[PDB]
Amino acid sequence: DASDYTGVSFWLVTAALLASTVFFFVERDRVSAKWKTSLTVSGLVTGIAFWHYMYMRGVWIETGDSPTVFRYIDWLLTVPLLICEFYLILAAATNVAGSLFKKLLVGSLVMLVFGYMGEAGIMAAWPAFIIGCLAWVYMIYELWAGEGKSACNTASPAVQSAYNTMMYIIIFGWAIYPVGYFTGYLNLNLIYNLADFVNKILFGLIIWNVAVKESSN
Amino acid sequence: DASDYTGVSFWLVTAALLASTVFFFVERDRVSAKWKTSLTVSGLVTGIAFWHYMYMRGVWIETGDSPTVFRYIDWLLTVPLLICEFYLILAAATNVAGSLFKKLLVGSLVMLVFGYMGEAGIMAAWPAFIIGCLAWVYMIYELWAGEGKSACNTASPAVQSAYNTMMYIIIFGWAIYPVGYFTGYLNLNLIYNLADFVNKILFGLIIWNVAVKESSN
Amino acid sequence: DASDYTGVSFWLVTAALLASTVFFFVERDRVSAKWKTSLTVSGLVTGIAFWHYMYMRGVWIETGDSPTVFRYIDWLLTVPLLICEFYLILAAATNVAGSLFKKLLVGSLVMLVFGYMGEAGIMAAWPAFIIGCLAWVYMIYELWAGEGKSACNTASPAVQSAYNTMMYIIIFGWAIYPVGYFTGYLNLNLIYNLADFVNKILFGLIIWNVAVKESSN
Amino acid sequence: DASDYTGVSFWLVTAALLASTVFFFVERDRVSAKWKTSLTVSGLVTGIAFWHYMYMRGVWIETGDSPTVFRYIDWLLTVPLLICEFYLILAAATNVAGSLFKKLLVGSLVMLVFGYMGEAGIMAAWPAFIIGCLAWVYMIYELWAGEGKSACNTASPAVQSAYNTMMYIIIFGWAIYPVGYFTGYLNLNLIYNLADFVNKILFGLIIWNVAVKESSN
Amino acid sequence: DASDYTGVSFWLVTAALLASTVFFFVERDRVSAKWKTSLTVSGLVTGIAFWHYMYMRGVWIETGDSPTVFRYIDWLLTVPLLICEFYLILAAATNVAGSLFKKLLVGSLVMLVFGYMGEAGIMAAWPAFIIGCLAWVYMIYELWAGEGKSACNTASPAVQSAYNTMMYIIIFGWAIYPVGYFTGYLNLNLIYNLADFVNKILFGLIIWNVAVKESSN
Ligand SMILES: *C/C=C(C)/C=C/C=C(C)/C=C/C1=C(C)CCCC1(C)C
Ligand SMILES: *C/C=C(C)/C=C/C=C(C)/C=C/C1=C(C)CCCC1(C)C
Ligand SMILES: *C/C=C(C)/C=C/C=C(C)/C=C/C1=C(C)CCCC1(C)C
Ligand SMILES: *C/C=C(C)/C=C/C=C(C)/C=C/C1=C(C)CCCC1(C)C
Ligand SMILES: *C/C=C(C)/C=C/C=C(C)/C=C/C1=C(C)CCCC1(C)C
C-alpha cells in the first residue's frame, strides 16, 4: 500500500540494484584494463545484493518478518568485496602491497562474524558489539592513517578524491548498520534499504567516475 | 479483447520497451567511448520501464486497477536518468560543468515528490501541482535559456539538433503527464503507455542517432 | 500429436526464431560498424517474433483458437523494422536519403492498420483490403521503381543482389499474408508459421550474408 | 534413482550441452573472424539440443514415454547445421563453392524426412529406411570422395585433420541413430543421450580446436 | 533456521558460485588470448556447480536427504575440467604435450567412476576406495613428479607458483572428499559445501591471478 513505506522502498531498491548491476557490467568498456576488475567487483556487489533482496522480498510476502540470516548472508558476501574495492582502486593507480587486501578482508570478516554472534544470542550483545566496532575502527584506521593512506599518498589527485569519498562512505554511510544493531539490543528494514542504496550504488558510482576519468585522461 | 484498447497497448509497449533495451545495449559498439554512457543510460531507462510494466500488467490481471505507486516508482527511477541524459550528451560533445547534472537531478526529484504528495492526498492538489509545475518549468529553463543552453552553444550542429529535439520532447512529450494529473484532480493508462513509448523510445533513438553520427564522422 | 501438423510447426518455428535471434546478435562481430545496425534490427525482428510466439503458444494451449490481435501486434512491431531494413542496407552501402525510411514506415503502418480494421469488422472487408493492398503495392513500387531503386543503382553488385532477393521476398514471401486474409473474408496458422520462417529468418540471413561479404572484401 | 541409468544420463547430457553452448559462444574471441561463424553454429547446435532436451525431460517426468516427434524436431533443427559445419570450416580455410552447402542441406533434410515418414507409419519401414540410408551415404560420399574432398585437398593439414575427424564422426558416430531405427522396426533413450554427447559436443570441440590453432598460428 | 548451519551454507555457496561464474566470464578481458580458455573453463566449473546446487537445494527442500547421484553428476562434469586446468595453464605458458591432458582426464574419470561404484554398492567399499585413491595418487604424481612437473620447470616463476598452489589444493583441498567417503563406509553436506567453495572458487582465483599477471607484465 501507500502507508507502509517499506514495500515501496523494497521495490525501489531492488530495481535500482538491478539497474546498477547492468550499468557496472556494461560500463567496463570505458575504463582501462586495470580498472575493469574494480568495476566488475562493484557490479558483483550490486548483483549479489539484488539476488538476496529478491529472496528477502519473497520471505516478506510469505511470512512478513525480518530475515536477519539472509541480510547477514548478503553482508558476508558483499562487505568483503566492498572493502577490497579500496585495494582494487589503489592497485589500479599505484603500488599497493596486498597485505592491505589481506588485513581488510580479515577485519571485515571478524566484524560480520561477531555481529552475527551477537544477533543470534550466541555471545552477549555488549561484548560482540564491542568486538565488531573494534574491527570496524581497525578497518577505518587502515584506510585513514594506516597502510591504505600510505598507498593513497602516491596516487593521482582524482584517485585520492575518490579514495577520500569512499572513506567518508565507510565512516558515515556504514555507521547506519551498527546503530540499528545498538537499537535492537538495549523502520529498520526501510533504513537498511536506503542505506544499501547509499552504500552499494553511490560507492560503485564513485569508483566508476574515477575509473572513467583516469582512463579518459 | 479487441475493445478495451488498453491491454493491447500494454503488450505493445512492453514488447517495444524490451526491444529498445536490447537495441540500446547492443548498439554501443557503433559509438565512441564517450557516448557509451549515454546509450547505457538510455537502455537502463527502457529496461526499468519494462521491468515495472511487467509488474503493472500482473497487477492489472490480478486486481484490475491503476497502480499509481508503481508508476511513480518507475518515474522516480527513470525521470532522473532521462533528465541527466542532457548532461550526458553535453559531456560527450563539449565541456559541461556537472552543476547542471546536480540541478537537473534536484529539479526532477522535487517534481516527482510533490506530484506524489498530491496524488496520495498528503498535500492539497493545487499547491503540490503548482510546485511540481514550477520544478518542471525550472528544468525547462535550465535546458532552454540556462546553463544547458550555454553548454549547447559550444557543441556540434548535430549535437545541437539532438539537444533541441530532446528539449521539444521534454516540453511537449512530457506535458502529457501533468495534464492527466490535472484531469485526475478537478484512457489515462492508454495515454500513459503511448506517452512512455514517445518519451522512452524516441528519446533514446534521438540520442543513438546523434551518437552514431558523431562517432562515424 | 503427430496428426495436427500445427503444434509441431509452432515448436519448430519458435526454436528456429530463438536460434536466429542468437545468431544475428552474435554474428555482429564479423560485420563492419555500418552493418551492425542492420544485423541488430534483424535480430530484433526475430526476437520479437519469438517473444510473441511464446504467448501465442500459451493461448493455444489454454483456449485453442487463433490470436488475431497477438499476430497483428507482432506485425505492428516487426513489419516496420523489416521494411526499414531496406533503408538500413542502402545506408550501409551508399547515400540514401531517409525520406525512404519515412515513406516505407508510413506505408507499412497504413497497411497493417487497415488490415486490422478489416479483421476486426470496424471497416468493410473489401475497402480495407483494397487500401492495405494499395499500401503494399506502394511499398513495392518504392522498392522496385521508386527512391529505393535509385539508391540501389549506386551500390555494390553484392548489395544489389541482396536488395533484389529481399525485394522478391517482399513481393512473393509477403503475398502469403493478404491471400489468407482474402480467404478469411469471402491450415492458416501452419501457413503463417512457415511464412514467418521464410520472411523472418531467410530475410535476416540474406542481410547477414551481404554484410559479411562486404565487411570481408 | 540409481538403477534406471536413464534420468542420470538425461541430466548429465543436459548440463553438458548447456556448458558446451556457453563455451562455444564465449570462445569466439580466440578465433579469427572467419571461424566465428563456425563456432556460432556449433554453439547453436548445442543450444537447440539443450532447449529441446529440457522439454523432453519435462515430458518424461509428466508421462514417461519417448518423444519421437520432439527428437525429430531437434534433429530437423540441428542435423542441417551440423552437416553445414563442413562447408563452414572449408570456407574458413579455402575456396569452397557453396554448391556443397546446398547439396549437403538437401541430403540431410531428405534423410530426416524419410526417417520420420518411416517412424510415423506414413511409409513402409523398409522403403523409408533405405531412402534415408541412401541420403546418409550420399552425404558420406560428398564428404569423402565428392566435392567436399576436393575442397579438403586445398586446405591446411590441421584443417584436413579436423575434416577427417569430423568425417569419421559422421560415419561412425552418426551410425548409432539408424541402427536404433532398425532395431525399432523388425536403452534407446540412454544410447541417444550418449550419442548426442558424442555428436554434439565432440564435434564442436574438434571445430573449436582447429579454429583456435588456425587463428593462433 | 539459525541452528542447522547447513541451509545457510547452501545459500552462501550457491550465491558465491554464481558470483564467481560471472567474475570469471567477465574478467577474460584482462587476460591474453591464451589464458582466455583457462578462465572460460574455470567459469564453466563454477557455473555447472551452481546449476547443480540449485537442483540439490530443490531436492533438499522437497524431500530433505543427500543427493549422492546429483553430487556425483556435478563431479563427473567438473572434476575433469578442474584437473585439465593444469594442462590449460601449462599450455598458456610453455610447451605441454597434451598426453598430460589425456592421462589426467582418464585418471579423474576412473577416480569418480570407482568412487560411485563404491557409493552405490555395486562394488565392495574397500576395493573401490583403494582404486579411487590409486587414481587420485596417480593424478598427484603426474602433477608432482611426472609429466606435469616437467612442463612446469619450463614456465615463468609466476606460473610455477600458481601451479604449486593448485597442486597443494589438489592434495589437501581435495582430500576432504575421500575422507568423508571413508567416514560413510566403516555435517557432510556442510563440509562438502565449504570444500566446494575452496576447490571451485579459490582454484579459479589462483588461475585468474596468474593469468592477469602474465598478461599485464
Ligand atoms: C551492503 C552491506 C553492507 C555494506 C553492510 C555493512 C554492515 C556493517 C558495516 C555492519 C557493522 C556492524 C558493526 C560495526 C557492529 C557489529 C554489528 C554490525 C555488524 C551491524
Ligand atoms: C518515463 C516516465 C516519465 C518521463 C515521466 C514523466 C513525468 C512527468 C514529467 C510528470 C510531471 C508532473 C508535473 C509537472 C506536475 C506534478 C505531477 C506530475 C508529476 C505528473
Ligand atoms: C513477420 C510478419 C510479417 C512480415 C507480416 C506481414 C504481413 C503483411 C505483409 C500483410 C499484408 C496484408 C495486406 C497486403 C492486405 C491487408 C491485410 C494484410 C495485412 C494481411
Ligand atoms: C544431434 C542429432 C543428430 C546428429 C541426429 C542424427 C540422426 C541421423 C544421422 C539419423 C539417420 C537415420 C538414417 C540414416 C536412416 C533413416 C532414419 C534415421 C533418421 C535415424
Ligand atoms: C567440484 C568437485 C570436486 C573437485 C570433487 C572432487 C572429488 C574427489 C577428488 C573425490 C575423490 C574420491 C576418492 C579419492 C576416493 C574414492 C571416492 C572419492 C570419489 C570421494
GROMACS .gro file of C-alpha atoms in nm, chain B residues 53-139:
model
   87
  270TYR     CA    1   0.549  -0.260  -1.678
  271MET     CA    2   0.562  -0.636  -1.629
  272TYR     CA    3   0.452  -0.599  -1.266
  273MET     CA    4   0.192  -0.337  -1.361
  274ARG     CA    5   0.046  -0.586  -1.610
  275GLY     CA    6   0.048  -0.852  -1.339
  276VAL     CA    7  -0.143  -0.625  -1.102
  277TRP     CA    8  -0.383  -0.536  -1.384
  278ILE     CA    9  -0.451  -0.906  -1.441
  279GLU     CA   10  -0.494  -0.982  -1.071
  280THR     CA   11  -0.698  -0.683  -0.946
  281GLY     CA   12  -0.767  -0.456  -1.244
  282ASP     CA   13  -0.687  -0.106  -1.120
  283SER     CA   14  -0.427   0.165  -1.180
  284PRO     CA   15  -0.104   0.118  -0.980
  285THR     CA   16  -0.023   0.483  -0.908
  286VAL     CA   17   0.253   0.385  -0.665
  287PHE     CA   18   0.416   0.158  -0.923
  288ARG     CA   19   0.407   0.428  -1.192
  289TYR     CA   20   0.561   0.679  -0.953
  290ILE     CA   21   0.831   0.426  -0.859
  291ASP     CA   22   0.911   0.380  -1.228
  292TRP     CA   23   0.920   0.758  -1.260
  293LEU     CA   24   1.144   0.803  -0.956
  294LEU     CA   25   1.388   0.565  -1.122
  295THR     CA   26   1.364   0.678  -1.487
  296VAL     CA   27   1.289   1.053  -1.492
  297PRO     CA   28   1.622   1.147  -1.325
  298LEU     CA   29   1.813   0.934  -1.576
  299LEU     CA   30   1.621   1.081  -1.869
  300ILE     CA   31   1.686   1.436  -1.749
  301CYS     CA   32   2.055   1.358  -1.688
  302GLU     CA   33   2.083   1.236  -2.047
  303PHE     CA   34   2.110   1.606  -2.134
  304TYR     CA   35   2.420   1.635  -1.917
  305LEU     CA   36   2.550   1.312  -2.070
  306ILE     CA   37   2.520   1.426  -2.432
  307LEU     CA   38   2.663   1.766  -2.342
  308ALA     CA   39   2.959   1.598  -2.170
  309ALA     CA   40   3.024   1.374  -2.471
  310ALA     CA   41   3.032   1.679  -2.701
  311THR     CA   42   3.172   1.979  -2.507
  312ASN     CA   43   3.272   2.098  -2.159
  313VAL     CA   44   2.968   2.087  -1.931
  314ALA     CA   45   3.008   2.171  -1.564
  315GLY     CA   46   2.821   1.898  -1.377
  316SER     CA   47   2.644   2.165  -1.177
  317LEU     CA   48   2.384   2.113  -1.449
  318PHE     CA   49   2.368   1.743  -1.361
  319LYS     CA   50   2.311   1.836  -0.998
  320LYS     CA   51   2.041   2.096  -1.056
  321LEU     CA   52   1.853   1.888  -1.313
  322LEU     CA   53   1.856   1.591  -1.077
  323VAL     CA   54   1.725   1.802  -0.790
  324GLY     CA   55   1.451   1.954  -1.003
  325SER     CA   56   1.329   1.620  -1.133
  326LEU     CA   57   1.323   1.474  -0.783
  327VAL     CA   58   1.126   1.771  -0.650
  328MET     CA   59   0.880   1.746  -0.937
  329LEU     CA   60   0.816   1.378  -0.874
  330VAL     CA   61   0.799   1.407  -0.496
  331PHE     CA   62   0.548   1.691  -0.492
  332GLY     CA   63   0.346   1.520  -0.764
  333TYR     CA   64   0.318   1.210  -0.549
  334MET     CA   65   0.235   1.416  -0.241
  335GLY     CA   66  -0.057   1.549  -0.441
  336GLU     CA   67  -0.154   1.205  -0.570
  337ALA     CA   68  -0.159   1.044  -0.224
  338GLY     CA   69  -0.356   1.328  -0.065
  339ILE     CA   70  -0.070   1.423   0.168
  340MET     CA   71  -0.073   1.778   0.031
  341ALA     CA   72  -0.356   1.971  -0.131
  342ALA     CA   73  -0.379   1.908  -0.503
  343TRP     CA   74  -0.338   2.270  -0.611
  344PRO     CA   75  -0.023   2.353  -0.411
  345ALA     CA   76   0.155   2.028  -0.497
  346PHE     CA   77   0.062   2.064  -0.865
  347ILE     CA   78   0.190   2.423  -0.871
  348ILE     CA   79   0.519   2.326  -0.706
  349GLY     CA   80   0.565   2.034  -0.944
  350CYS     CA   81   0.494   2.258  -1.242
  351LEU     CA   82   0.747   2.510  -1.109
  352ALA     CA   83   1.007   2.232  -1.091
  353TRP     CA   84   0.914   2.126  -1.445
  354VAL     CA   85   0.948   2.483  -1.574
  355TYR     CA   86   1.278   2.520  -1.388
  356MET     CA   87   1.415   2.216  -1.571
   0.00000   0.00000   0.00000
